[PDB]
Amino acid sequence: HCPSDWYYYDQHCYRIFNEEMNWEDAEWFCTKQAKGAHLVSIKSAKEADFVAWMVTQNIEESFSHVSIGLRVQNKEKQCSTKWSDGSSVSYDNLLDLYITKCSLLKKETGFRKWFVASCIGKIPFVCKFPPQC
Amino acid sequence: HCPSDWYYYDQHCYRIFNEEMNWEDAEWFCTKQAKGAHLVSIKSAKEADFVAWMVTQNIEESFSHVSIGLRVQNKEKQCSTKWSDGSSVSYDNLLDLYITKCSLLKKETGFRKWFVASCIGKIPFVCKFPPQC
Amino acid sequence: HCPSDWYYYDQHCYRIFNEEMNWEDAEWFCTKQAKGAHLVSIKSAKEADFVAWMVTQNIEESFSHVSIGLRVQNKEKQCSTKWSDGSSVSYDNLLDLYITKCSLLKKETGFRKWFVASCIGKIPFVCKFPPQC
Amino acid sequence: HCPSDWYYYDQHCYRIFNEEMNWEDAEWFCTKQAKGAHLVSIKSAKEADFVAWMVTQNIEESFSHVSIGLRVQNKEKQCSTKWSDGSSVSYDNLLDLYITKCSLLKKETGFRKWFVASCIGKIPFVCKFPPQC
Amino acid sequence: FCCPSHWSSYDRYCYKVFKQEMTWADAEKFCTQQHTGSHLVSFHSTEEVDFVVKMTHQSLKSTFFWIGANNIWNKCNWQWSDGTKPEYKEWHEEFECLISRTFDNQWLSAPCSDTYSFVCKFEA
Amino acid sequence: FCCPSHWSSYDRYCYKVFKQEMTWADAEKFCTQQHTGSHLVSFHSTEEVDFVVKMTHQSLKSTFFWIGANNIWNKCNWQWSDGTKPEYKEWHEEFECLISRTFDNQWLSAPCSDTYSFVCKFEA
Amino acid sequence: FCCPSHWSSYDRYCYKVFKQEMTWADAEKFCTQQHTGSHLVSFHSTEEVDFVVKMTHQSLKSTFFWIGANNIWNKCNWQWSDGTKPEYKEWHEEFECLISRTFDNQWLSAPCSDTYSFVCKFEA
Amino acid sequence: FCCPSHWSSYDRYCYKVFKQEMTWADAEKFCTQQHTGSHLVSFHSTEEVDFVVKMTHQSLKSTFFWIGANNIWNKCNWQWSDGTKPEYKEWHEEFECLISRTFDNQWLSAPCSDTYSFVCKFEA
């Protein structure tokens, strides 16, 4: 069973918060909600369908993008370590504006496929955690 | 050559006894008849045909099943050591009535194919042993 | 070049003697004729054709078989060391009359193919040796 | 950039000299022209086309053959070390006139394919070297 | 950890009874498709059998349901009382699978091609 | 151990004479199908030959029967008296197999494609 | 060592800007065919970027040109904030490649299927 | 050991001149079919060349005959005076084979596709 406003699917609880936040803050926020909570992770088409369905039913009409837990672990600006000529990418002037190490879902596709995105954007997000029994 | 009422086929002697007995008692009975005697064993289609023919000619019309020497060596109630989920079968509540560790032949099929059966049933049986020369 | 009555083909000298002798005596006879001489050996179709041609032109019309140098080295009566059941052939009562460890050529086939034969038969034979230069 | 009368293609300088010389003298001559200079070497169809084009535009109408840097390193008269019978070629009476260890280009083929030739012939030749920057 | 809705929980496993009557092989595949780690029930204690029997008796109208064990006599080590091994065989094709009762803790068997209800199980 | 009915026994083996006239290869295959371990007779003593000869003389009307040895001259090691080995060959295709007499203990041979009666043998 | 005619030189490398607008993959192949060791430009210092930017600004009318790095986000190591790895995937097919500006030393990206001008480079 | 009739002997080898005019490859194969160990002549001394030249001058009407060496310039190790190896090649397909004179001990070459007389040789 789960808190009010939270949905129970399979063995976890999900909830979309219509508060605009960047990936880090969203993830931190989620961990405060409950033990083991994090930004939602989609581990199967069935869960993908459910999460999409839920977002559709509770997101604010103004908002259109929602954050999910996928993030790039690499420390470099982008993940290509070599240029087409074989040399290493030891010098990198990519603009922060173009560093897209986070992910999200969008209304334009029924909240289904995953899209890469800047981690400094402030958007709604869905949390997920496993309730105890 | 063989005792009276016994049939000689290939290199052994066979005989069906129309005395109802359980597998163990039948097997013990057979061993008392002669050296190396045991419940019949069928080791080829030719021997299978002969034994079937013999049973047909000497079994009592009332009886329909006849015991043969095949038996399960396993000590457990049934021989499946694992469940479909991969776990071991360490707990087993199979009813004795459903433990079929013995075998027999039946008139319904001309005494040909082999059928599994309870070892506590009392039926006719055929013995077999190799005569000396 | 070669002695009178001997034919020179390729690098050797051949000659058929119309004296009836058994294989051993023929072979011994040949070795006395010259250094390195032996009963003829056929080592190619070309030599086979030549030797056949020569025999045809010099053999006595009465004679029809001619000895050649091929012989069985095995010491046993016949060369089958095992019976069809896998056991060894340690006991052998084959009649001498049927022990054919030698070979010959016959007029019936234009003196071409080789035939097995008794070594105690007395027939004409051809010798062969390599002349020196 | 390159000296007067020299052509610049890709990263090297080429020039055909209409002075009749044998391979060795031509090669020595080329090395005196500049650092790293040698008789031309053709290392690609593109360079082959360019060198052919250049020769065509600057060779004397009287001359028809032009030397290039390819030469046999082998010390023996010819390079076949074994005869068809497997024996080694330890004795060799090939005439000098027939020892063709050098190469050249000819007008008859638009100065394209390479031909083997005597190294004692005196003909025009093209030099090549890499200019410094 | 909790069990999905419409599933019952016991010990640390999840159970669910299905009425559709299927063959052994089909029931097992079916269970497989219902959830990760799901299979036909398996039992490792009397208490557990009790639980699925009570759970099953209050939902099923039938009396028998498939259990996760199949071909119980085909795997056996058969031997002739005369000591030798059955090189030549003339068996009658037979495949028995285990089934549970809805009114007792004892089990029985039935031809695997037969058709009965069943219950699925998975951990976590 | 005893011999099957219609088979004779000697030493610890079983023998049986067959009148059908077959080729060597066929007789052997045939014997193979008559009983496990069965093949054309093989001999390992004078006493044994005696036994099958007596047994065979009283049943066969022919005079010769196939024995379990074939291709007796094809297996040989042929060599030219000049020492060398027959690399090039021009033999006349010939396959001799052994046969026994019905009135003596001596053996002979005959083209394996020929047709004679025979006797089968097996142990136990 | 010198650079071929119609190519610019910097450090010990050769550069050449091409106006034809091609996709990333095509630009790279194209560079490959222009000279041995040739590829889309790669940068290993600020001074070098400066050089191709000046060189490129005075020849190109466009504003962006392809750089030798592709699929910059496909190679990444993505992980769920919950620690686990993305076994199941549902990404939206996307391939970003790097591009340079003609008025600055900073770089950006663009779908590799897009069409821009470019510059080739090779050593010696 | 002696030489076959119609063959000449020298040292411990056998020689025979053939007038038919064939290509190098054909002459060699031909020699191969004439006798075991037979091939186009090979020379390992001045005295031997002398012998086949005299022998050949008195039988052949031509002036040149094939010798057992082929592709004399294809096997060579060609190198550019600049040290490097000919990775890229643009040779003109050419195959020279050796030939002897009938009036001298000196040898020459000729395209292997040409047609000349020849002499075969073998040991023993």
For residue B6, the tally of other CB atoms under 10 A from its CB is 18
Tokens coding F73: 């001259």
Instruction: Tell how strand H107-111 and strand H96-101 pair up.
Output: antiparallel
List the single residue in G73, G80, G91 with the smallest CB-CB distance to A113: G91
Cβ–Cβ below 8 Å for F1 and B130: yes
Q: Which residues pair with B68 in a beta bridge?
A: B103
Nearest CA in chain G to A96: G108
DSSP per-residue string spanning B54-120: HHHHHS-SS--EEEESEEE---SSSS--B-TTS-B-----B-GGG---EEEEEGGGTT-SBEEE-TT
How far apart are the CA of E50 and the nearest CA of chain B, in angstroms? 12
Nearest CA in chain G to D132: G1
Q: Which of A100, A130, A111, A128 is nearest to A17 (CA)?
A: A128
Touching check for B130 and chain F: CB below 8 Å? Answer: yes
Cβ–Cβ below 8 Å for F1 and B133: yes
Touching check for B57 and chain E: CB below 8 Å? Answer: no
Cβ–Cβ below 8 Å for A73 and G77: yes
Question: How far from the centroid of its chain's Cα atoms is residue F5's Cα?
Answer: 22
For residue E33, the number of C-alpha atoms closer than 13 Å in the C-beta half-sphere is 7
Chains that touch E (3 or more CB pairs under 8 A): A, B
Tokens coding A122: 């402030």
**What would the CATH number be for the domain defined by C1-133?**
3.10.100.10
Q: How far is CA D100 from CA A104, D95, E111, F97, H69, in A?
A: 74, 10, 90, 70, 16
Cβ–Cβ below 8 Å for C133 and H2: yes
Q: Is A59 left (phi over 0), alpha (psi -120 to 50) or beta?
A: beta
Kindly give, in sequence order, each residue whose CB lies less than 8 Å from that of residue A81, ignoring residues fewer than 6 positions away.
A88, A89, G75
Instruction: Tell how strand D38-39 and strand D123-129 pair up.
Output: antiparallel
* Three-state secondary-structure class, residue H45: coil
Touching check for F9 and chain B: CB below 8 Å? Answer: yes
Q: What resolution in angstroms does the PDB record give? A: 2.7
Cβ–Cβ below 8 Å for E45 and B91: yes
> Cβ(E56)–Cβ(E102) under 8 Å?
yes
Partners of D78 on chain H (C-beta within 8 Å) are 69, 72-73, 98, 109
Touching check for B45 and chain F: CB below 8 Å? Answer: no
Touching check for E76 and chain A: CB below 8 Å? Answer: no
> Cβ(B16)–Cβ(B125) under 8 Å?
yes
Phi, psi at residue B107, to the nearest 5°?
-60, -30
Tokens coding H11: 């040292």
Read off the DSSP letter of residue D53: H
Output the CA angle E48-A13-E43, nearest 5 degrees. Answer: 10
* Three-state secondary-structure class, residue H46: helix
How far apart are the CA of A55 and the nearest CA of chain G, in angstroms? 17
Partners of E43 on chain B (C-beta within 8 Å) are 91, 93
Cβ–Cβ below 8 Å for A133 and E4: no
Partners of F124 on chain B (C-beta within 8 Å) are 11
Partners of G107 on chain A (C-beta within 8 Å) are 92-95, 98
Cβ–Cβ below 8 Å for H72 and D78: yes
Chains that touch C (3 or more CB pairs under 8 A): F, H
Touching check for E123 and chain A: CB below 8 Å? Answer: no
Candidates A1, A11, A12, A129: best to mutate against E (most CBs of E within 10 A) is: A11
| Whole-number Å distance between alpha carbons of C86 and F39 | 9
CATH architecture for segment(s) E1-124: Roll (3.10)
Q: Which of B66, B58, B78 is nearest to B107 (CA)?
A: B66
DSSP per-residue string spanning C75-92: -SSSS--B-TTS-B----
B abuts A (3+ Cβ pairs < 8 Å): no
Q: How far is CA A60 from CA A55, A123, H103, in A?
A: 9, 11, 109
Question: How far from the centroid of its chain's Cα atoms is residue F106's Cα?
Answer: 13
Cβ–Cβ below 8 Å for D130 and G2: yes
Kindly give, in sequence order, each residue whose CB lies less than 8 Å from that of residue C22, ignoring residues fewer than 6 positions away.
C119, C120, C121, C122
Structure-solving method: X-ray
User: Domain coordinates of chain G in residue numbers?
Assistant: 1-124
Cβ–Cβ below 8 Å for F81 and C27: yes
| Whole-number Å distance between alpha carbons of C29 and C38 | 8
Touching check for F3 and chain C: CB below 8 Å? Answer: no
Read off the DSSP letter of residue C94: B
Kindly give, in sequence order, each residue whose CB lies less than 8 Å from that of residue F15, ignoring residues fewer than 6 positions away.
F7, F8, F9, F41, F51, F52, F55, F119, F120, F121
Chains that touch D (3 or more CB pairs under 8 A): G, H
Tokens coding C46: 């070309």
| Whole-number Å distance between alpha carbons of F81 and C38 | 6
C abuts D (3+ Cβ pairs < 8 Å): no
* Three-state secondary-structure class, residue C4: coil
Output the CA angle H11-H16-H22, nearest 5 degrees. Answer: 135
Cβ–Cβ below 8 Å for C94 and F108: yes
Cβ–Cβ below 8 Å for H4 and C131: no
Touching check for D100 and chain H: CB below 8 Å? Answer: yes
Touching check for E10 and chain A: CB below 8 Å? Answer: no
Nearest CA in chain F to C100: F73
Separate counts of helices (H) and strands (E) for chain G: 2, 8
| Whole-number Å distance between alpha carbons of C117 and C103 | 5
| Whole-number Å distance between alpha carbons of C112 and C104 | 10
| Whole-number Å distance between alpha carbons of D23 and D100 | 11
Touching check for E79 and chain B: CB below 8 Å? Answer: yes
Q: What does chain B come to in residues? A: 133
User: Domain coordinates of chain A in residue numbers?
Assistant: 1-133
Which residue has tokens 């709604």? A124
Kindly give, in sequence order, each residue whose CB lies less than 8 Å from that of residue C49, ignoring residues fewer than 6 positions away.
none
Partners of B116 on chain E (C-beta within 8 Å) are 73, 94
Interface size, chain A vs chain E, as Cβ–Cβ contacts under 8 Å: 18
Touching check for G3 and chain D: CB below 8 Å? Answer: yes
Which residue has tokens 């000098």? D96
